[PDB]
Amino acid sequence: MKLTGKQTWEFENPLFVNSSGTAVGPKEKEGPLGHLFDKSYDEMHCNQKNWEMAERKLMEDAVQSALSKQNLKKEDIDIFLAGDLLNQNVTANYVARHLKIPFLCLFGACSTSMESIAISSALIDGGFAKRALAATSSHNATAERQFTVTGSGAVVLSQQPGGIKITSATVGRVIDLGITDSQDMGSAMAPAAADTIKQHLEDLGRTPDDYDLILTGDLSGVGSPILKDLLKEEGINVGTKHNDCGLMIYTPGCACSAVVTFAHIFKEIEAGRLNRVLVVATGALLSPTIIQQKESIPCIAHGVVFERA
Amino acid sequence: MKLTGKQTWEFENPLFVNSSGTAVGPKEKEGPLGHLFDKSYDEMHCNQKNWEMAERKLMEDAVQSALSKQNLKKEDIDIFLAGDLLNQNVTANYVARHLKIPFLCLFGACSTSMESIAISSALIDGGFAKRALAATSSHNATAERQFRYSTVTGSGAVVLSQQPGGIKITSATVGRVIDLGITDSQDMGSAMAPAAADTIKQHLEDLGRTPDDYDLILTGDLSGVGSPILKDLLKEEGINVGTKHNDCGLMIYSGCACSAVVTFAHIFKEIEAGRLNRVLVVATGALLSPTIIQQKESIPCIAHGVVFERA
């Protein structure tokens, strides 16, 4: 069995990130990581007619950057796993239609960036695909349509040697402790990130000392301190080992886990500044209906371990 | 490799449907198959306060039926694959929270019924899970919300594992998105046929098979209008299904969402009874949302297939 413990998949065959691509808007371009993205636009329309075509252009850009880096055509990919981080896959389905790659459509939450890589990894490791493409996108301009980073990240994975290996993934379970305040996203998502991180370490018999970095996505300032405290209650001390993507992309539930992980964290690993990193993307599973009814907001966090090859 | 041809996964290890569960509304109860569903309700609210709690109760019923028939508890399942037709985080997410099973959230479309089984199947065959639960649901009363601002009222769930059962799963074909330019939200049957045809053709080609190798080729929700088109398209590719084709949308009472409940309640019984030995089930989905319809964009469609056989 490749399932280790309760929720962690340990891949047994060689598995690598062969290339990645990122495309972002102006707010991201002006931030500390602005120069690391493959595409970065000076204005939010991304030279497009409207917001829909803007986000579609961001994903197409990110995907073509990833493919270009390996001189791959769309026909060279066996499976495509993608979803929007915010909307109802309005972008992902359009891009899938153009790529013509067999398509597994995932539900768009901020956890989708790692959910798509986890599934892609299992399919490649299980012999169901030679190469997989995983992608997600979001656009600040349309993030309101529930009752946010502007960008998209894509990765190409395969068993062919690359600078970064994927060694395990932990699938999260939905966690909902009550929060209904659509603006209290930090306090709602933290318990999910905590459960997934705790289960991952328990499953692999590891501690934060086995990681160079434990990176969360989308907890930002409010959620991070809560996550650390919750982990301490479980006897898990992340210490200075924890950082959040929402905290690195802008100067002094924003779906930024993918573009920061792909544009920045992967570069750090390939440069040998980080050897093993646990990345946990956390999503608030909501939408108009949920909020329209003042219901609690369920959250989920999925994790993936990347290591220098 | 388990990948065969371009888009077909052939499972190399023992893989079975251990049980299934279906829960439906009054309209389905009154239909020709009404007697085959595990649970049915006399009124669409299903004893619940609103349409959201109604659909949630239906999925909880179907999942509990599937689990109960095998004497399993929610803790006995390693992975849960599910989605619901509104994509409002209302049903599947709610049910996943209560079950506490590691959850892979799929985008709801009428094609999700087979997408969830295909992924579940690969994860089991790949050693990533011992048992998987897959479920989908829809409700007639909120079906309009996919387009704005005939759908089945029910839910089907299945428990899968390597433990011997009456029904084996031998392959699955993952579809690619096909879009020939149909904008009309109710010419959905015709927007979906091309996707269903592409998947059936590729599935047959990948495995070096013809319709003669199947006792039944069943499409999910093409219904009255889409079925003739599908057969015409397959013929244009030199594939003659003849009388081997049927559609779930024609057996329960397009974009109907009846694929899972008809397959689970009816088709599975036919296979276990020995009346059908190998069946290709292809669920077809129109990938849309109000944003799509609102801007009168063409409607992308996708079809995923799974082959079920008598053990």
Q: How many beta-carbon pairs below 8 A join chains A and B?
A: 162
Q: Are A214 and A278 in contact (CB under 8 A)?
A: yes
Distance CA B173, CA B93 (A): 26
Yes or no, beta carbons of B89 and A298 under 8 Å apart: yes
Three-state SS string over chain B comes to: CCEECCCEEECCCCCEEEEEEEEECHHHHHCCCHHHCCEECCCCCCCCCCHHHHHHHHHHHHHHHHHHHCCCCHHHCCEEEEEECCCCCCCHHHHHHHHCCCEEEECCCCCHHHHHHHHHHHHHHCCCCCEEEEEEEECHHHHHHHCCCCCCCEEEEEEEECCCCCEEEEEEECCCCECCCCCCCCCHHHHHHHHHHHHHHHHHHHHCCCHHHCCEEEECCCHHHHHHHHHHHHHHCCCCCHHHEEEHHHCCCCCCCCHHHHHHHHHHHHHHHCCCCEEEEEEEEECCCHHHHHCCCCCCEEEEEEEEEEC
Return all residues near B235 (Cβ < 8 A) that are at least 6 apart. none
Residue in B closest to A289 by C-alpha:
B88
Q: Using CB atoms, which residue from A52, A88, A129 is nearest to B3?
A: A129
A256's torsion region: left (phi>0), alpha (psi -120 to 50) or beta? alpha
CA distance A125 to chain B (A): 8
Distance CA A30, CA B223 (A): 52
Tokens representing B160?
Answer: 């899968």
Q: Please provide the size of chain A in residues.
A: 309
Yes or no, beta carbons of A171 and B52 under 8 Å apart: no
Distance CA A246, CA A285 (A): 18
Tokens representing B4?
Answer: 């065969």
Q: Are A41 and A26 in contact (CB under 8 A)?
A: yes
Distance CA B136, CA B92 (A): 7
Instruction: Specify the CATH number for the domain of residue B17.
Output: 3.40.47.40
Distance CA A18, CA A222 (A): 34
Provide the domain limits for residue A37. 2-309
Yes or no, beta carbons of B105 and A87 under 8 Å apart: no
Mutation pick from B53, B80, B86, B103 vs chain A, by most beta carbons of A within 10 Å, is: B103
Yes or no, beta carbons of A88 and B177 under 8 Å apart: no
- Residue reference for tokens 């570069």: A267
The distance of Cα B194 from the centroid of its chain, to the nearest Å, equals 18
Q: Using CB atoms, which residue from A9, A102, A119 is nearest to B119?
A: A119
The distance of Cα A201 from the centroid of its chain, to the nearest Å, equals 19
Q: Using CB atoms, which residue from A97, A101, A290 is nearest to B88?
A: A290
Distance CA A172, CA A196 (A): 5
Yes or no, beta carbons of B179 and A97 under 8 Å apart: yes
- Residue A275's Cβ-side half-sphere holds a number of Cα atoms within 13 Å equal to 3
Residues of B in contact with A129 (CB under 8 A): 3
CA distance A169 to chain B (A): 11
Yes or no, beta carbons of B127 and A2 under 8 Å apart: yes
Yes or no, beta carbons of A93 and B287 under 8 Å apart: yes
Residues of A in contact with B87 (CB under 8 A): 88-89, 107, 287
Residues of B in contact with A174 (CB under 8 A): 93, 96-97, 100, 103
CA distance A271 to chain B (A): 32
Distance CA B43, CA B26 (A): 6
Residue in A closest to B146 by C-alpha:
A88
Tokens representing A123?
Answer: 């399919």
Distance CA A281, CA A138 (A): 14
Cβ-in-10-Å burial (0-12, 13-18, 19+) of A200 comes to buried
Q: Please provide the size of chain B in residues.
A: 311
Q: Are A213 and A20 in contact (CB under 8 A)?
A: no
CA distance A80 to chain B (A): 9
Yes or no, beta carbons of B123 and A128 under 8 Å apart: no
Mutation pick from B52, B95, B104 vs chain A, by most beta carbons of A within 10 Å, is: B104
Tokens representing B173?
Answer: 């074909």
Residues of A in contact with B145 (CB under 8 A): 289
CA distance B36 to chain A (A): 31
Closest CA to A133 of A52, A218, A60, A53: A60
Yes or no, beta carbons of A100 and B176 under 8 Å apart: yes
- Residue A158's Cβ-side half-sphere holds a number of Cα atoms within 13 Å equal to 18
Yes or no, beta carbons of A289 and B127 under 8 Å apart: no
CA distance A1 to chain B (A): 5
Yes or no, beta carbons of A298 and B9 under 8 Å apart: no
Q: Using CB atoms, which residue from A1, A97, A107 is nearest to B105?
A: A107
Distance CA B282, CA B261 (A): 13
Residue in A closest to B4 by C-alpha:
A128
Three-state SS string over chain A comes to: CCEECCCEEECCCCCEEEEEEEEECHHHHHCCCHHHCCEECCCCCCCCCCHHHHHHHHHHHHHHHHHHCCCCCHHHCCEEEEEECCCCCCCHHHHHHHHCCCEEEECCCCCHHHHHHHHHHHHHHCCCCCEEEEEEEECHHHCCCCCCCCEEEEEEEECCCCCEEEEEEECCCCECCCCCCCCCHHHHHHHHHHHHHHHHHHHHCCCHHHCCEEEEECCHHHHHHHHHHHHHHCCCCCHHHEEEHHHCCCCCCCCCHHHHHHHHHHHHHHCCCCCEEEEEEEEECCCHHHHHCCCCCCEEEEEEEEEEC
CA angle A291-A292-A296, nearest 5°?
Answer: 35
Burial of A142-179, coded b for 16+ CB within 10 Å and e otherwise, reads bbebbebbbbbbbbbbbbeebbbbbebbbbbbbbbeeb
CA distance A74 to chain B (A): 12
The distance of Cα B83 from the centroid of its chain, to the nearest Å, equals 11
Task: Tell whether the torsion through CA atoms of A139, A142, A148 and A154 is positive or negative.
Answer: negative
The distance of Cα B36 from the centroid of its chain, to the nearest Å, equals 17
Q: How was this structure determined?
A: X-ray
Residues of B in contact with A100 (CB under 8 A): 176-177
β-pairing verdict for A16-24 and A151-158:
antiparallel
For chain B, the domain total comes to: 1
CA angle A132-B136-A55, nearest 5°?
Answer: 45
Yes or no, beta carbons of A173 and B129 under 8 Å apart: no
Residue in B closest to A287 by C-alpha:
B88
